[PDB]
Every structure is written in structure tokens, then in C-alpha cells.
Design a protein around this ligand. Sequence first.
Ligand SMILES: Nc1nc2c(ncn2[C@@H]2O[C@H](COP(=O)(O)OP(=O)(O)NP(=O)(O)O)[C@@H](O)[C@H]2O)c(=O)[nH]1
Ligand SMILES: [Mg+2]
Length: 149
Amino acid sequence: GVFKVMLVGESGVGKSTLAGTFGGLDTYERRIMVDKEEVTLIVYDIWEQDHCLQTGDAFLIVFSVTDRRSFSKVPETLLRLRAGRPHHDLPVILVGNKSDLARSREVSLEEGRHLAGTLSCKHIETSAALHHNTRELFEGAVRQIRLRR
Ligand SMILES: Nc1nc2c(ncn2[C@@H]2O[C@H](COP(=O)(O)OP(=O)(O)NP(=O)(O)O)[C@@H](O)[C@H]2O)c(=O)[nH]1
Ligand SMILES: [Mg+2]
């Protein structure tokens, strides 16, 4: 029961901060409880601007809601990941991070959801800074990976 979740996306969106919420005080491992069953979750924060793609069980494509450029890069990023394992139904979620910065937002909630719906991904918004929805993010990953097994 081992789950490998890869954080990927443009520089500055919050990948390391997201990993930090899971790992506390570039790979983090913990046994967590999801749906009454314990599992080993390893969160990878080794994406650079590969080993990542083959290794992963799930891919969290992180963009920042305050960085429209990072959002525009999502389609081409997802395409490359999927193309590297064309036979696999990869669990993927688009993670709109920095939701706490309301007065700096460059990407809307509904836009994120439309993108995820169009590309057949999951979608969630997080604040890695305040641990808003970060637990839900990683637990959700475990659930989708389970469906692939
Ligand atoms: N307000 C706010 N700031 C955030 C949030 N997540 C990350 N940040 C801030 O955004 C900056 C970049 O975070 P970081 O996790 O380093 O991003 P990264 O994607 O790992 N960068 P890189 O790809 O270059 O390693 C940091 O200054 C961090 O404190 C968030 O949810 N809210
Ligand atoms: Mg980083």
C-alpha cells in the first residue's frame, strides 16, 4: 500500500510549501489514514523547469491563482505527462494554490474548474500557507490512486 504523489508546475506557484504542509519539520514520507485504511504516502517535490513521470502514481499540477502565466502552462504540461505514459489512466489534479491572496487573484475558481473539466482532471484550490485544503488534496490523491488499482 504505497502511494507516490508528484508535485509539478511552474516556479513560484507553491510546490515546496505544499510539500511542507505534509512533511512538517525533497521527498516526504508518512503513514496517513484515508477511508479507515492506513497507507504510506510519499510526496515528491523534485520537479525542475524524466524520473518524475514513470515514478509517479498521481500528478498534482500546481499553478498559482495569482499567476495567470502558470495557469496557461497547465495544458502543455499535462499533455507531456500523459504522452509519456500513453497507455495509463493517470490520476491528475490541477491545484490552484495561493487562494488566500484574494486581492491578487489572476485566475478564477470557475476557470480552474472549466480547465479541469475540459482535460478530464480533478480540481481543487489550496492555500499552502494556511493549510487550506492541503490535507484534502493529499487524501484525495490516495483515493483516486486506489481506483487505479
Ligand atoms: N500567500 C501565499 N503565499 C504562498 C502560498 N504558497 C506558497 N507561497 C509563497 O510563494 C513563494 C514560493 O513558494 P514555493 O513553495 O517556494 O514555490 P515553488 O513552486 O516551490 N518554487 P520553485 O519551483 O522555484 O522551487 C514563497 O515565498 C511562499 O511563501 C500560499 O498558499 N499563499
Ligand atoms: Mg521548490
